[PDB]
Design an enzyme around this catalytic site. Structure first.
Site, PDB file in Angstrom:
ATOM      1  N   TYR A 592       0.825  -1.199   0.000  1.00 21.07           N
ATOM      2  CA  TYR A 592       0.000   0.000   0.000  1.00 21.07           C
ATOM      3  C   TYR A 592       0.869   1.263   0.000  1.00 21.07           C
ATOM      4  O   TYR A 592       0.626   2.212  -0.756  1.00 21.07           O
ATOM      5  CB  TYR A 592      -0.950   0.002   1.208  1.00 21.07           C
ATOM      6  CG  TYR A 592      -2.221   0.760   0.897  1.00 21.07           C
ATOM      7  CD1 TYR A 592      -3.405   0.087   0.608  1.00 21.07           C
ATOM      8  CD2 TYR A 592      -2.226   2.147   0.832  1.00 21.07           C
ATOM      9  CE1 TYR A 592      -4.553   0.765   0.300  1.00 21.07           C
ATOM     10  CE2 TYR A 592      -3.367   2.828   0.522  1.00 21.07           C
ATOM     11  CZ  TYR A 592      -4.530   2.131   0.262  1.00 21.07           C
ATOM     12  OH  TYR A 592      -5.676   2.815  -0.042  1.00 21.07           O
ATOM     13  N   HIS A 701       7.548 -10.968  -0.684  1.00 18.49           N
ATOM     14  CA  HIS A 701       7.074  -9.649  -0.297  1.00 18.49           C
ATOM     15  C   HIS A 701       7.897  -9.027   0.841  1.00 18.49           C
ATOM     16  O   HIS A 701       7.903  -7.806   1.023  1.00 18.49           O
ATOM     17  CB  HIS A 701       5.592  -9.703   0.076  1.00 18.49           C
ATOM     18  CG  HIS A 701       4.976  -8.356   0.284  1.00 18.49           C
ATOM     19  ND1 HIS A 701       4.723  -7.480  -0.754  1.00 18.49           N
ATOM     20  CD2 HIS A 701       4.558  -7.736   1.410  1.00 18.49           C
ATOM     21  CE1 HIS A 701       4.182  -6.375  -0.271  1.00 18.49           C
ATOM     22  NE2 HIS A 701       4.073  -6.506   1.040  1.00 18.49           N
TER      23      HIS A 701
HETATM   24  C1  LIG Z   1      -4.019  -6.918   7.356  1.00 20.31           C
HETATM   25  C2  LIG Z   1      -3.523  -8.332   7.560  1.00 20.31           C
HETATM   26  C3  LIG Z   1      -4.740  -9.249   7.607  1.00 20.31           C
HETATM   27  C4  LIG Z   1      -2.517  -8.754   6.481  1.00 20.31           C
HETATM   28  N1  LIG Z   1      -1.695  -7.619   6.004  1.00 20.31           N
HETATM   29  C5  LIG Z   1      -1.884  -7.035   4.789  1.00 20.31           C
HETATM   30  C6  LIG Z   1      -2.961  -7.496   3.822  1.00 20.31           C
HETATM   31  N2  LIG Z   1      -2.476  -8.490   2.877  1.00 20.31           N
HETATM   32  C7  LIG Z   1      -1.040  -5.877   4.365  1.00 20.31           C
HETATM   33  C8  LIG Z   1      -1.189  -5.255   3.023  1.00 20.31           C
HETATM   34  C9  LIG Z   1      -1.927  -4.110   2.758  1.00 20.31           C
HETATM   35  C10 LIG Z   1      -1.984  -3.633   1.451  1.00 20.31           C
HETATM   36  C11 LIG Z   1      -1.303  -4.284   0.422  1.00 20.31           C
HETATM   37  C12 LIG Z   1      -0.550  -5.418   0.697  1.00 20.31           C
HETATM   38  C13 LIG Z   1      -0.495  -5.891   1.993  1.00 20.31           C
HETATM   39  C14 LIG Z   1       0.026  -5.397   5.260  1.00 20.31           C
HETATM   40  C15 LIG Z   1       0.848  -4.333   4.890  1.00 20.31           C
HETATM   41  C16 LIG Z   1       1.837  -3.875   5.749  1.00 20.31           C
HETATM   42  O1  LIG Z   1       2.629  -2.809   5.357  1.00 20.31           O
HETATM   43  C17 LIG Z   1       3.366  -2.041   6.320  1.00 20.31           C
HETATM   44  C18 LIG Z   1       3.922  -0.746   5.757  1.00 20.31           C
HETATM   45  N3  LIG Z   1       3.666  -0.543   4.456  1.00 20.31           N
HETATM   46  O2  LIG Z   1       4.568   0.042   6.472  1.00 20.31           O
HETATM   47  C19 LIG Z   1       1.987  -4.522   6.985  1.00 20.31           C
HETATM   48  C20 LIG Z   1       1.166  -5.592   7.351  1.00 20.31           C
HETATM   49  C21 LIG Z   1       0.173  -6.030   6.481  1.00 20.31           C
HETATM   50  C22 LIG Z   1      -0.727  -7.175   6.832  1.00 20.31           C
HETATM   51  O3  LIG Z   1      -0.577  -7.728   7.937  1.00 20.31           O
END
Ligand SMILES: CC(C)Cn1c(CN)c(-c2ccccc2)c2cc(OCC(N)=O)ccc2c1=O
Ligand SMILES: *[C@@H]1O[C@H](CO)[C@@H](O[C@@H]2O[C@H](CO)[C@@H](O)[C@H](O)[C@H]2NC(C)=O)[C@H](O)[C@H]1NC(C)=O
Ligand SMILES: CC(C)Cn1c(CN)c(-c2ccccc2)c2cc(OCC(N)=O)ccc2c1=O
Ligand SMILES: *[C@@H]1O[C@H](CO)[C@@H](O)[C@H](O)[C@H]1NC(C)=O
Ligand SMILES: *[C@@H]1O[C@H](CO)[C@@H](O)[C@H](O)[C@H]1NC(C)=O
Ligand SMILES: *[C@@H]1O[C@H](CO)[C@@H](O)[C@H](O)[C@H]1NC(C)=O
Ligand SMILES: *[C@@H]1O[C@H](CO)[C@@H](O)[C@H](O)[C@H]1NC(C)=O
Lengths: 727, 725, 74
Positions: A592, A701
């Site tokens: 994101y 990732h």
């Molecule tokens: C919500 C959970 C169920 C799973 N989840 C997900 C969802 N797949 C995402 C995420 C959000 C959008 C796109 C891909 C991954 C994620 C992104 C993170 O980024 C940290 C940063 N950018 O600083 C950290 C943790 C998470 C995570 O735990």
């Protein structure tokens, strides 16, 4: 004297000490001293050795992890660890009888086991292998095969598929025992029509032809997995006769179309609660299901269904919250959005339809951490109205207005972020404090909330960091349209407000994200602030979490809009604060974050000079369904296709002529597919934009390999330094 | 004061005019006229327009083709490129007289190849991997094969590796001289393993596509081939057409082998050359048709061998035969008793052929054969391996051989090729440099100059306003050997200044990067605008100098051609007009491999470099090419060296240089994998470097936008490494 | 039963039985050979051989085979 360097971060010179303990009774817990696993007595501490590590060194394998049986008679020993996705993995397991002192060698747990778990009491074993569920009553006895339908990449009995692992259950497991280990409940996932993401794994240079990995992964709008639910009785298994599981079907209003199972909680020895969520994730149902002796079936009385829904957005932060049943299972607590849009503890009665909220205010309950008959314990950001603080509170069940803060005052300067771990019946608790100061682990009694002792206080890291010029964190807010929005800044040492510092903006900004908190960290930013004199900042704008639904549901059906605009504004505010060099403002992030970064750089704002997108999302049709659709709905003419069309990074390619851009993506990324960046790159080439790129062969990732992790930060460091004319 | 800028290169501001013609008969050819196509008479000079071709009344026509007799024109459209040569298209036929389309029995959509008979208007095409024949454009086809299966059986067309490496063509069809027979090869990739890569497509493709190609990497299971002929006359309609298999000879059937040449000798004689998979041994077979059988018999006495004890046979394959009219004799370029490649007059009966040419230079190819003279190209003139000239040789008396092109234009023209009229009565001379290209038409009757077809005076005119670079070709002696090089030299080249050097390298077996060809390329811009000397050097491994030099790296890729590019840079800097501190190196494919290997060498000479779609270890690249030079990668053959000659193993040494690795993600040829393994190697030793992938670009990185993008990215990189603003 | 005929490849140092010189002997009504396939007797050059095989009438007789032809002559 000398600063916090890149090599400091990368190599990990300045270690942060944990205190990972495992409760086993109400009075006792397991710690790992010098490998030797000791047991401690919370009351006093006469804490002799539990399992000396002179035991398992002629084991002939690496003791990756372990797990004691609840009654304490055996010890599951994990080895042959092979990571699959974020949570999933396989491994080999030997059991070891503690009393008889030998390791069991008959009716062994097979190589390549996908998941193991004890019963919650005693020592039954349930485990998954080749997608089927097996149960042992005794370790040394043959398994009872519960399921005969498992099939690689198609039918998953008792374990989750890709999307339920990452997005729904945050775990590979899909096995839930009843509290006294009588029943084993489980999910079956069918992926037949779930299309496959395909990508090259290059392996060692010895592999001559690239391998093509194929994972069932529903991208936005694709055919999803389907889910069925079963409970089988583990005290009535048989050698002669195939164990017969009883299905609990989803409620009418969920079968009418695509849906998900999103939560399973046992209320009692004979009552289970299931929460289902519609594919459009604004409507969810909790079924309360009771065992019936005479039939042997489970009845989910329509009159005890509990609807949770959203009008402004989606249900839950990422998923509806879990109920916390009273001992008798006739009532429960859960966190739900209130009429003000703030998330708070609501007390429900099985029979009745309406709840009573027992917390309220402009702050949110984060989690219910423990329920006794006298107190409900929870974590919230109430304290000092800091949405980025966390504290333990206890509600007095006899009069819920009587609420005490256990962690607030313990050490307010050092400690504003807290998590907690209660003993079995909650009579004791460990408090873990993550900042703003050095982490502090401490043990406490619930009886008086008397502070017993310090488990870990990281004085070693302290008497060590004093010879290092550390940055300072500033956590504060700015006001946009009557709303507080929060931000943090890692500030270089000796920070001078007369000076124009170059600024990097560390962005996540996904729905329910929160990058502005009181957590203490040693990371890349610590390096950029300490050595390079760059202000690393983050800002939680619209979409961000733990500040109510008005803020969080602001990006509903509209990703790549308000959360993007708000980051450009934070930059504008930080420039207007007067200690930022307008000519040197960068922006970077991951997932994101990398999408936002990319959307910002492509915005034509002119605020940003450069940016780095690491494993970005480029187009929401490329990301998985459960996440994306929660926020974006379906990508169809009848739902939200146009905004899927509008919110792509590629469509802004032309405007990357206005920035310097580094695009980094690992090729074996199962989550945010390399595709996403392959399409960004292509779009940029087609409009003549120059930019830096870096692929990481076979990395996923996390780009988490030791040597890859080092390479990426080194490469990002050079880019930043250069963008900022640093030497 | 204007220079040849990056955008001039990228946008083709300074266009070289060509005079590409084609001979309908012995007296006349065709030439384009913006869109119109005229029929030039080579004798008188007069012409007449025939068509307006560039979207012709509803589709845009990609190419055309006249039927020898001039009765039917074949129109090619819906061109969809496959690999380096292969592609797919739709085809329409016209009664070239009446100018009306043959509407009935249209040639099907997605046809893989089509061809006229060499006389008349017979038509043979391939479609869904099978061969079809058409005696008339309006009559229905007769289906020659039925075993065609996608990615598995190729009837009449090549598969990946034959296309790229063996035939340099998609077709595996050959009509007899008088259109009576259609010989063809059929390839089998059943047990050939597939390279797989993702193809990402337009952004509307939600799930990336996996492309799967049967592709034999070094050591893998190769394809197998069978060869057939069929009488295109007597082609029954009530019954499947029978095809007569000419089998390979016993010596080849012993093991893995290839078909590496097909040449018709007469109406009833056909010659095939087969190559052992270890390519130091090849065999020619001459096959007469048996009228009493319906069959083809090739005699064991008639067989010939092409041995090689020092390396492989051929430059890339055994040279082809040119048969005298009767068919009892033929001439073939071969490696002489002491390394040099020369023409050998063979009698069909005996083996011992006597060489019709000798000396310390090679013949580059036979071009024309007649009753009394044989015309050929060679690099003899002034002992310049990088020169090409046209020589006429007296079949009656071998000592008496005249050079036709050598002296026509000494200073402007040292690099000629030629296109002869259908019989030979006239011929075209293409001169490619070292001056601006010159196209001239000659009567072979008395070897006289008839006219100038295109002299490029347009490009000449506007290049006088441009500060063009200079080209210096010359040699340096190493271990008493003449080793040639070229230098693109900035304008106003003052050699009491110290310029930076970009070493431009291919360096693969039989390469020649130092020649007399005029070029407008990325190097032109580098020297003209950035004042960079771009240089190339033909070291050990390079071609057209004898096998001594060429076979020097036999079974030993990654050694001397790498080592020799380094001493090249040392030699250039010794000449005293190079900045030691700013010598760069770059290459594509093999050149990428060599660049990487040099950058991996620890030599200290090179500051930075760019490898584009490089080979990284030879086990990854295709069997046919690799094995020719390396052999099989087995402990009982040459595995040890395969292991020792990888760029990955030299990662640690990239700590001394700045590296730019570029690679296209849909490279069918040098697979992305190769670069994926370089990067991972470099990551794992902790070496920082620059990277660029090109989504869906193949080995050409040839898309308009990616071609533009790659060269810009590489300019930025060179400028920065060199500190050029 | 299949008779193979294998030549030594001089430069290779290997043996090579060409499929064109495979000879099939099979029986429609029983097993092949009296107790086993009859042994061949080669001509000096080895381009040809004589062999007892059952004829079209069931009687075993001396067939004359060419190394390269399927058909023999009794
Ligand atoms: C919500 C959970 C169920 C799973 N989840 C997900 C969802 N797949 C995402 C995420 C959000 C959008 C796109 C891909 C991954 C994620 C992104 C993170 O980024 C940290 C940063 N950018 O600083 C950290 C943790 C998470 C995570 O735990
Ligand atoms: C292509 O070659 C393959 C073998 O590589 C041939 O398939 C063998 O064919 C026989 C006879 O049909 C089968 O009994 C074998 O089991 C096959 N093996 C495999 C691996 O497929 C195929 O028939 C050939 N086709 C042509 C037209 O030559
Ligand atoms: C030999 C032919 C039948 C096909 N062929 C091949 C096939 N191997 C290669 C090549 C060589 C090694 C590795 C990958 C490709 C090639 C490379 C060239 O390099 C340009 C440069 N680097 O300056 C130019 C032409 C060719 C070419 O024509
Ligand atoms: C795998 O596990 C089996 C039994 O489950 C064990 O006996 C064996 O040693 C293990 N290793 C291999 C290579 O199979
Ligand atoms: C799984 O896949 C399909 C539904 O698309 C169905 O035919 C089949 O019954 C299902 N299998 C199981 C084991 O539930
Ligand atoms: C159990 O079910 C399987 C799968 O349907 C079947 O093949 C078998 O008869 C049963 N096995 C036992 C142990 O009863
Ligand atoms: C476990 O629960 C079951 C079902 O409620 C009950 O029948 C059984 O007695 C319990 N077992 C124990 C050991 O308490």
């Amino acid at each position: 004297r000398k600063t916090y360097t890149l090599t400091d971060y990368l190599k990990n010179t300045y270690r942060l000490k944990l205190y990972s303990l495992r409760w086993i009774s109400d009075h006792e817990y397991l710690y790992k001293q010098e490998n030797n696993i000791l047991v401690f007595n919370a009351e006093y501490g006469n804490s002799s050795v539990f399992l000396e590590n002179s035991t398992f060194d002629e084991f002939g394998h690496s003791i990756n992890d372990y797990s004691i049986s609840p009654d304490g008679q055996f010890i599951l020993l994990e080895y042959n660890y092979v990571k699959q996705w974020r949570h999933s993995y396989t491994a080999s397991y030997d059991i070891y009888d503690l009393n008889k002192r030998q390791l069991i060698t008959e009716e062994r747990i097979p190589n390549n086991t996908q998941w193991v778990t004890w019963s919650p009491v005693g020592h039954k074993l349930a485990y998954v292998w080749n997608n089927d569920i097996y149960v042992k009553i005794e370790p040394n006895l043959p398994s009872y095969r519960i399921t005969w339908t498992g099939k690689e990449d198609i039918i998953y009995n008792g374990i989750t598929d890709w999307v339920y692992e990452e997005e729904v259950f945050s775990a590979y497991s899909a096995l839930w025992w009843s509290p006294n280990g009588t029943f084993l409940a489980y999910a079956q996932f069918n992926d037949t029509e779930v299309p496959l993401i395909e990508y090259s794994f290059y392996s060692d240079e010895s592999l001559q032809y690239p391998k093509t990995v194929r994972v069932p992964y529903p991208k936005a709008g694709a055919v999803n997995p389907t889910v069925k639910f079963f409970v089988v009785n583990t005290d009535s298994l048989s050698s002669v006769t195939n164990a017969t599981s009883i299905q609990i079907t989803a409620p009418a209003s969920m079968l009418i179309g695509d849906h998900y199972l999103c939560d399973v909680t046992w209320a009692t020895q004979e009552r289970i609660s299931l929460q289902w969520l519609r594919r459009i994730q604004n409507y969810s149902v909790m079924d309360i299901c009771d065992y019936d002796e005479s039939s042997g079936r489970w009845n989910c009385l329509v009159a005890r269904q509990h609807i949770e829904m959203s009008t402004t957005g989606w249900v839950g932060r990422f998923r509806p919250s879990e109920p916390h049943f009273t001992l008798d299972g006739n009532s429960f607590y859960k966190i739900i959005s209130n009429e003000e849009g703030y998330r708070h503890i609501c007390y429900f009665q099985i029979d009745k339809k309406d709840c009573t909220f027992i917390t309220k205010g402009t702050w949110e309950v984060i989690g219910i951490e423990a329920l006794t008959s006298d107190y409900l314990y929870y974590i919230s950001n109430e304290y000092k109205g800091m949405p980025g603080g966390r504290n333990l509170y206890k509600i007095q069940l006899s009069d819920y207005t009587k609420v005490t803060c256990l962690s607030c005052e313990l050490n307010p300067e050092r400690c504003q972020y807290y998590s907690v771990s209660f003993s079995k019946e909650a009579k004791y608790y460990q408090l873990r404090c993550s900042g703003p100061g050095l982490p502090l682990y401490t043990l406490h009694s619930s009886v008086n909330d008397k502070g017993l002792r310090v488990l870990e206080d990281n004085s070693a890291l302290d008497k060590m960091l004093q010879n290092v010029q550390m940055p300072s964190k500033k956590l504060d807010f700015i006001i946009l349209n009557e709303t507080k929005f929060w931000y943090q800044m890692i500030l270089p040492p000796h920070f001078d407000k007369s000076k124009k510092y170059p600024l990097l903006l560390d962005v996540y900004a996904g729905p329910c994200s929160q990058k502005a908190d009181t957590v203490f960290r040693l990371n890349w930013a610590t390096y950029l602030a300490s050595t390079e004199n760059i202000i690393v900042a983050s800002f939680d704008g619209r979409g961000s979490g733990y500040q109510g639904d008005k803020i969080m549901h602001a990006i509903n059906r509209r990703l790549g809009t308000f959360e993007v605009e708000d980051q450009i504004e934070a930059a504008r505010q930080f420039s207007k604060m007067g200690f930022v060099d307008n000519k040197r403002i960068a922006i970077w992030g991951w997932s994101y974050g990398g999408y936002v970064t990319s959307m910002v750089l492509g915005s034509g704002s002119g605020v940003f000079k450069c940016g780095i997108a690491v494993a970005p999302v480029s187009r929401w049709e490329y990301y998985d369904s459960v996440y994306t659709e929660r926020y974006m709905g379906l990508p169809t003419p009848e739902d939200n296709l146009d905004h899927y069309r509008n919110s792509t990074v590629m469509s802004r390619a032309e405007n990357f002529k206005q920035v310097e851009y580094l695009l980094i993506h690992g090729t074996a990324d199962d989550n945010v597919h390399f595709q996403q960046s392959a399409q960004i790159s292509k779009a940029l080439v087609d409009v003549g934009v120059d930019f830096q790129a870096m692929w990481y062969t076979d990395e996923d990732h996390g780009i988490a390999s030791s040597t890859a992790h080092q390479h990426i930060y080194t490469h990002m460091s050079h880019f930043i330094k250069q963008c900022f004319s640093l030497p």
